[PDB]
Specification:
The structure is cut from a larger assembly and holds chains A (about 100 residues), B (about 140 residues), C (about 120 residues), D (about 55 residues), E (about 210 residues) and F (about 150 residues).
Chain A (H helix, E strand, L loop, with lengths): L3 E11 L2 E11 L6 E11 L9 E7 L7 E11 L2 H12 L8
Parallel strand pairs in A: 3-5
Antiparallel strand pairs in A: 1-2, 1-4, 2-3, 4-5
Chain B lengths: L4 H13 L5 E5 L2 H12 L3 E9 L2 E8 L19 E3 L8 E2 L13 E6 L2 E4 H7 L3 E7 L1
Chain E lengths: L7 H7 L37 H16 L3 H13 L4 H9 L3 H8 L5 H9 L3 E3 L2 E2 L12 E4 L7 H8 L10 E4 L4 E4 L14 H9 L1
Antiparallel strand pairs in E: 1-2, 1-3, 3-5, 4-5
Helix pairs in contact in E: 2-8, 3-4, 5-6
The chains are: A mainly beta (about 100), B alpha+beta (about 140), C mainly beta (about 120), D mainly alpha (about 55), E alpha+beta (about 210), F alpha+beta (about 150).
The structure holds zinc ion (ZN).
The site of zinc ion has 7 residues of chain E, from helix 1.
The structure holds two RNA strands.
Family (chain D): Belongs to the universal ribosomal protein uS2 family.
Protein name (chain D): Small ribosomal subunit protein uS2
Subunit structure (chain D): Part of the 30S ribosomal subunit. Contacts protein S8 and may contact the N-terminus of Era.
Chain lengths: ~100, ~140, ~120, ~55, ~210, ~150
RNA sequence: UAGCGCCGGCCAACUCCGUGCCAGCAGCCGCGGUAAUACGGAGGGCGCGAGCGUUACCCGGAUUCACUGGGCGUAAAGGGCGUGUAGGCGGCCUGGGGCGUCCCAUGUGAAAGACCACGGCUCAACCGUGGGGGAGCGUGGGAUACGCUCAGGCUAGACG
RNA sequence: AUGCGCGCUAGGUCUCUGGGUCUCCUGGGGGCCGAAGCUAACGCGUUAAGCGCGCCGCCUGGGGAGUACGGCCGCAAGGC
């Protein structure tokens, strides 16, 4: 079977492309505590019918570009903006982490 | 704030036991009462009942001790010597059927929250299921 | 520390440091003796310990020790260095294998011949 | 001190303990007054009479 | 090879009547009947209390010298027994008694374990009608340990087997004296052997 | 009637008006290899008197040990000060795996097979006391049932 | 053919000579300035044995990076103090989902190595033939106690 | 020389500040003795250094050394 992931759209600033943040939980190898991680996947959409703060579902596909290997299957839930601003604030905190 | 109710209940039981009280009160909960019934069945506590305290649901626990000892320090031997909490918030402990611990060569009990209700180690082994490891008592 | 702290930072593994850096991870090095000088022990001990100064096949040049009763170590002797450190002498970290290259086994040993390399004495 | 010594040698302790006493160190306890000579006399007299009768 | 040299010195050092030298250690010459103190210049002085390590080492050495095998072989046998199932001591004692030389000694073909070793090495002994010439050979229950047809007329075996007439062999062994052949029945028990060794000390020694 | 065993002789000194005055202390274990153990610590100006006092103390202070198959019913770990001991049951044919002090104490108990580990501080006196406490804190199936079920 | 190390405590093995802080030994503690079981040689003894020692490296002992299994008043260790972002964690009662979690079947987890059993080299090393075990990850199904999520309520936390 | 928050575990005594039906009960704050308990000990003990939970910050022998190099912040001395 082909791998299927679920995440929230966090970007639409590209032509026929969206950025999906896939969320994963797993127990730590050593300390046993359940650890939560995330990864960003560039997904292909020809219809531009997906927007920011949309919970979508992706599938493994043949390569489209250098970083694109996934297509969008189905919209699950819409308007989940909270995750989007969470990601944006986490990303925006970086400017305050510089040295110079 | 209060982060762990079950750990709180264990600590309350331990503290009341160490001072040889006849009774202790803990805020009421289904999970707590299940743990209490499991403890009572194995004969670790005299009994429990649901009481009402100032318009709030409470569970009153009756503690059990041994006979008054001879010589200096005549305080009775405890029935609950040691009660730890295994799976804590921030580190959950899960065990399979093959990984259910044996406590004090079966002189103690390990209480599991299995898919088929809250069971002891013995019942969990017999039924052949695992779950969150709550506490060990001996 | 908390489990979260251990996840975020973890525990660091302790690193051992070699006490014989001149060997460069070898049991023995062949060197050439330069200076044969006697020196004194640290404090409670008082003697005239014989010490060589050797330049090895490595880039290093370290003080050695000469074990036994008598030696024939010259200012140009080619000798094999060894591990082991002398507690008394402050700076030596190496011994010399007696009877390998230029050095010879200390004469008329009869008890411990594996050390201080000497042939089995012929009895008649 | 006497109570402690009696504990050490497994000798049962009988006491006319009062408010400021420790009940645990006493096996057979008479909760009453240890002052007010009247009470002491009453308890000791009764006990001694029982001892004499029980010979 | 094995230990070659004086014998009853070991009798003295261990301080127990070790039956190593055949018959002389039966007659009043075992060096236990006379001068029973350990050998050496200080053999007859007041000995200090032995250490735990001393006691365990002495026990192990005594047990090993009873059978007279290499320390390496002893270690290997101990490891094999430990890795097996059951009681370590019992299994170890059973395995030590399965040696061909020891079995030959037990049957009475020889007067000593060393003589039995020599007889085995020289090919005088046969197992299941096949020549075996290895002291360390392990036998199994239901094996025929007999003398070769060539060696049957030897004076040594003759006197050995005539002197065994009306003499009771170990319960786990059955001997057909007239047929010059024997049988291995079962692994010997702890109680069967009258060894002056407490194997617990051996286990404790090898534990460290 | 009872076996005696020696742990340590230690010589302590107290200063005086320009001089050193010595005293001897002995740790002694007394048992019968049937389940009774006694440990005594005696201080006396001389070694014989120290040994005698330690023997006396051990004879007075005795503990019953609930053996079965020459081993301990259940595992235990006890901390006495900065020293921790661990005791575990063992299968027959294991031997007493212990340090000098725990081995000596458990030998006179009749214990044949046990696994032990010395943790924290390794003061012989404290280790001995911890071992004694651990032996004092052992329960059988019968005792547990009598406590719980009644 | 019988050798090699060791005999102060760890750690099993003790006397006589030469020696006089010299020659020297040493892994640690340390031993040696005329009565050395510590140096050198003998006799004796202990351990291993066609091997015995030495050096280099790794693990253990080290619970001395501690998840199993540590600590921070005075031993090394509470930030000079607040507010607060990300993150971590989280009251009581019901219901839906089954992501974590648990269970069953199944695919994989090559061979060789590890384990058990039986066999072939006269034994063993070595090898052969069978049988299991196996962390993990797919795939189908089952459970809902505890985490998660969602929906509806409660006032014991918090706020007004 | 004791991070914060919450819960449980005998009391006695002196104070500051409220409320009530005012010899007393009931809250909050600051001291001194001391149950159980804890600690290597001194000692702590309902204002825990006790029994627990969550999060954070630090420790891994003594010197060399809060030094050198590199970086950041200051007019500088200097600070991290
Ligand atoms: Zn003999």
């Amino acid at each position: 079977p082909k791998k299927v992931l679920t995440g929230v759209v966090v970007s639409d600033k590209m032509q026929k492309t969206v950025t999906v943040l896939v969320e994963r939980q797993f127990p730590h190898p050593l300390y046993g505590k359940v650890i939560k991680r995330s990864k960003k996947y560039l997904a292909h959409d020809p219809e531009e019918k997906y927007k920011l703060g949309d919970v979508v579902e992706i599938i493994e596909s043949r390569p489209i570009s250098k970083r694109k290997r996934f297509r969008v299957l189905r919209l699950v839930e819409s308007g989940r903006m909270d995750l989007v601003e969470k990601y944006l604030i986490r990303r925006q905190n970086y400017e305050s982490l510089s040295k110079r | 704030m209060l982060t762990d109710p079950i750990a709180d209940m264990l600590t309350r039981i331990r503290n009341a036991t160490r001072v040889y009280k006849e009774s202790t009160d803990v805020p009421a909960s289904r999970f707590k009462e299940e743990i209490l019934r499991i403890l009572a069945r194995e004969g670790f506590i005299k009994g429990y009942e649901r009481v009402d305290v100032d318009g709030k649901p409470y569970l009153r626990v009756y503690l059990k001790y041994g006979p008054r000892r001879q010589g200096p320090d005549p305080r009775p031997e405890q029935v609950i010597h040691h009660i730890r909490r295994i799976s804590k918030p921030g580190r959950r402990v899960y065990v399979g059927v093959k990984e259910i611990p044996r406590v004090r060569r079966g002189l103690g009990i390990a209480i599991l929250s299995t898919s088929k209700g809250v069971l002891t180690d013995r019942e969990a082994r017999k039924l052949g299921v695992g779950g969150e490891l709550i506490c060990e008592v001996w | 520390p908390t489990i979260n702290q251990l996840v975020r930072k973890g525990r660091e593994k302790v690193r051992k440091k070699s006490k014989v850096p001149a060997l460069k991870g070898a049991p023995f090095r062949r060197g050439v003796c330069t200076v044969v000088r006697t020196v004194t022990p640290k404090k409670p001990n008082s003697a005239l310990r014989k010490v060589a100064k050797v330049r090895l096949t490595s880039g290093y040049e370290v003080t050695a020790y000469i074990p036994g009763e008598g030696h024939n170590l010259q200012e140009h002797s080619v000798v094999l260095i060894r591990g082991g450190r002398v507690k008394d002498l402050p700076g030596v970290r190496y011994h010399i294998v007696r009877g390998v290259y230029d050095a010879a086994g200390v004469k008329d040993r009869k008890k411990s011949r594996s050390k201080y390399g000497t042939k089995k004495p012929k009895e008649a | 001190i006497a109570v402690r010594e009696a504990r050490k040698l497994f000798i049962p302790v009988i006491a006319l303990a009062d408010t400021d006493s420790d009940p645990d160190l006493v096996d057979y306890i008479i909760p009453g007054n240890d002052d007010a000579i009247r009470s002491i006399q009453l308890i000791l007299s009764r006990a001694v009479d029982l001892i004499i009768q029980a010979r | 090879g094995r230990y070659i040299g004086p014998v009853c010195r070991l009798c003295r050092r261990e301080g127990v009547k070790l039956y190593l030298k055949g018959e002389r250690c039966y007659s009043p010459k075992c060096a236990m009947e006379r001068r029973p103190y350990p050998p050496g210049q200080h053999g007859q002085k007041r000995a200090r209390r032995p250490s735990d390590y001393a006691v365990r080492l002495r026990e192990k050495q005594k047990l090993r010298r009873i059978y007279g095998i290499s320390e390496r072989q002893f270690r290997n046998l101990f490891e094999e027994a430990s890795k097996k199932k059951g009681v370590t001591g019992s299994v170890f004692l059973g395995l030590l008694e399965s040696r061909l030389d020891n079995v030959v000694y037990r049957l009475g073909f020889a007067v000593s374990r060393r003589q039995a070793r020599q007889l085995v090495r020289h090919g005088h002994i046969t197992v299941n009608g096949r020549r075996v010439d290895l002291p360390s050979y392990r036998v199994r229950p239901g094996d025929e340990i007999a003398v070769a047809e060539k060696s049957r007329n030897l004076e040594l075996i003759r006197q050995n087997l005539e002197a065994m007439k009306g003499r009771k062999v170990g319960p786990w062994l059955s001997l057909d004296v007239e047929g010059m052949k024997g049988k291995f029945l079962r692994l010997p028990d702890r109680e069967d052997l009258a060894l002056p060794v407490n194997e617990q000390l051996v286990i404790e020694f090898y534990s460290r | 009637d009872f076996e005696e065993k020696m742990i340590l002789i230690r010589r302590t000194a107290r200063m005086q008006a320009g001089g050193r005055r010595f005293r001897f202390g002995a740790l002694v274990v007394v048992g019968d290899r049937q389940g009774r153990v006694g440990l005594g610590f005696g201080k006396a100006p001389e070694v014989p008197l120290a040994v005698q006092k330690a023997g006396y103390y051990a004879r007075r202070n005795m503990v019953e040990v609930p053996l079965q198959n020459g081993t301990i019913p259940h595992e235990i770990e006890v901390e006495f000060g900065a020293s921790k001991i661990v005791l575990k049951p063992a299968a027959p044919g294991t031997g007493v795996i212990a340090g000098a002090v725990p081995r000596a104490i458990l030998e006179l108990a009749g214990v044949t097979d046990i696994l032990t580990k010395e943790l924290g501080s390794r003061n012989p006196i404290n280790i001995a006391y911890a071992t004694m406490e651990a032996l004092r804190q052992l329960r059988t199936k019968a005792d547990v049932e009598r406590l719980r079920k009644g």
